[PDB]
Design an enzyme around this catalytic site. Structure first.
Site, PDB file in Angstrom:
ATOM      1  N   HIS A  41      21.507   5.966 -44.958  1.00 25.82           N
ATOM      2  CA  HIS A  41      21.825   7.208 -45.643  1.00 25.82           C
ATOM      3  C   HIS A  41      20.759   7.378 -46.726  1.00 25.82           C
ATOM      4  O   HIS A  41      20.677   6.575 -47.654  1.00 25.82           O
ATOM      5  CB  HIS A  41      23.240   7.098 -46.241  1.00 25.82           C
ATOM      6  CG  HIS A  41      23.723   8.335 -46.933  1.00 25.82           C
ATOM      7  ND1 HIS A  41      23.926   9.531 -46.275  1.00 25.82           N
ATOM      8  CD2 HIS A  41      24.059   8.557 -48.225  1.00 25.82           C
ATOM      9  CE1 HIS A  41      24.354  10.442 -47.134  1.00 25.82           C
ATOM     10  NE2 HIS A  41      24.439   9.878 -48.327  1.00 25.82           N
ATOM     11  N   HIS A  65      23.302  14.022 -46.412  1.00 29.44           N
ATOM     12  CA  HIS A  65      24.133  15.250 -46.585  1.00 29.44           C
ATOM     13  C   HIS A  65      23.332  16.375 -47.253  1.00 29.44           C
ATOM     14  O   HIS A  65      23.803  17.519 -47.320  1.00 29.44           O
ATOM     15  CB  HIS A  65      25.403  15.037 -47.429  1.00 29.44           C
ATOM     16  CG  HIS A  65      26.242  13.859 -47.020  1.00 29.44           C
ATOM     17  ND1 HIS A  65      26.672  13.650 -45.724  1.00 29.44           N
ATOM     18  CD2 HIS A  65      26.764  12.845 -47.755  1.00 29.44           C
ATOM     19  CE1 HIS A  65      27.399  12.548 -45.675  1.00 29.44           C
ATOM     20  NE2 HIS A  65      27.475  12.042 -46.894  1.00 29.44           N
TER      21      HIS A  65
END
Lengths: 248, 248
Positions: A41, A65
């Site tokens: 991530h 994200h």
């Protein structure tokens, strides 16, 4: 070339990333940190002062994200070849925040404050847990219809959380095949290695070892049902994407 | 060219960055977020998906707790011209963590756990609040004696928190002059605008508006005094830097 698992918060990032790790491994993921090691991530990496090579020679699979247009992603502008855009029903995302925050379906006062903020923001903008994710349609547009604005060489494949849950081995294969990670043989095992059950068991086992970790709107008040339905059937980019990915 | 206010956690980063902002402004800093706007903390920027231009044409002043060698800083390898390395007594840093964590000098059990971890780590490695900062001597070495390893074109100026506190306008000027921000005239006002008093008042005012925010070892147990003194007078890079910046 560079690949991304892009996903708005609470879309099922951890699960898809876990499946992709056990698939690539051929083994189950023993500890939570195995997810960050298998499909890092980016926010995670940045927090440590890591920053993966721009223009790698072999395939690198990362997750984020962030919207595609965040300045930090510019370093990967030209090297980005593929994007898997993981999408989930916005209704469930909003309920998911309530759960992860430990709010029971009986603290209506506090739930109303989350749903009203989510409706007005069209996403998670006001939730401090995450940053740079934009609103829900902004996020999706940036990784899909406007992806070439940020990554001119990128091909994109959308996958809905709901299709992953209905047919895990079928939809995972679509992803595995699109990312060109290998044959369909290992897909069955990857799915079995990462069920909701196996996942919670592995997360609890990790928390205990000391390692680092982590329905409907009717019960709320009819005037939040109508506020959501207004947004869901209105004329904003939110409604556009809700219709497009079958959430209307 | 690129400049850095480098500092290990709890060294007085917020204060020096606040003074440098009010100096540059010529006005006091009205709200906490004024610090992040005046001298952006890189970790802060990364969290939002920002990432300042590599090779700016005019002078850019940024701050960080990262060691100079973190991969993410490589983008600034060649463009980095100057570094101000803010340093503080390691004894006080360790006490500072206890304060910011709300631990009174009467929860000796919990304090001992912090001081023993800090002594064994030679810094803050185990404290999850921060990442990529390394140990205390690793951090300083990276920004000072080995700076050219990470930033080949950089000149460096060290400043001790203790000298800033003893003579704020004298030491601030050293910094202002080294960074070439202008004359010594405005230095007096910058100091007055950012005292401990004015700082707490401004932080409380901000917290209340809703805006985003944030001695000796004897009282602990003599065997932590000796454990610290052993480290402080031993043969590690920790002792080296403690002697060099007058903390022995």
């Amino acid at each position: 070339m560079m690949c991304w698992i892009a996903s708005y918060p609470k879309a099922g990032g951890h699960w898809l990333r876990c499946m992709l790790t056990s698939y690539v491994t051929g083994e189950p993921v023993e500890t939570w940190p195995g997810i960050q090691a298998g499909v890092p991530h980016l926010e995670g990496l940045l927090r440590d002062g890591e920053a993966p090579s721009a223009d790698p020679d072999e395939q690198v699979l990362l997750a984020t994200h962030f919207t595609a247009d965040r300045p930090v992603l510019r370093f990967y502008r030209e090297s980005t070849a593929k994007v898997v855009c993981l999408i989930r029903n916005p209704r469930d995302a909003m309920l998911s925040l309530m759960r992860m925050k430990g709010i029971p379906p009986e603290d209506v006062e506090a739930c109303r404050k989350i749903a009203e903020t989510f409706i007005a923001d069209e996403g998670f903008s006001s939730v401090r847990i995450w940053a740079g994710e934009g609103s829900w349609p902004e996020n999706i547009r940036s990784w899909t219809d406007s992806v070439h604005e940020s990554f001119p060489n990128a091909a994109v494949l959308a996958v809905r959380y709901e299709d992953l849950r209905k047919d895990p081995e079928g939809e995972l294969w679509k992803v595995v095949d699109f990312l060109e990670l290998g044959g369909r043989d290992g897909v069955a095992d990857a799915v079995a290695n990462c069920t909701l059950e196996r996942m919670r068991e592995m997360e609890e086992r990790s928390k205990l070892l000391g390692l680092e970790t982590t329905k409907s709107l009717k019960f709320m008040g009819d005037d939040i049902e109508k506020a959501y339905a207004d947004l869901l059937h209105g004329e904003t980019d939110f409604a556009h994407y809700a219709r497009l990915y079958g959430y209307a």
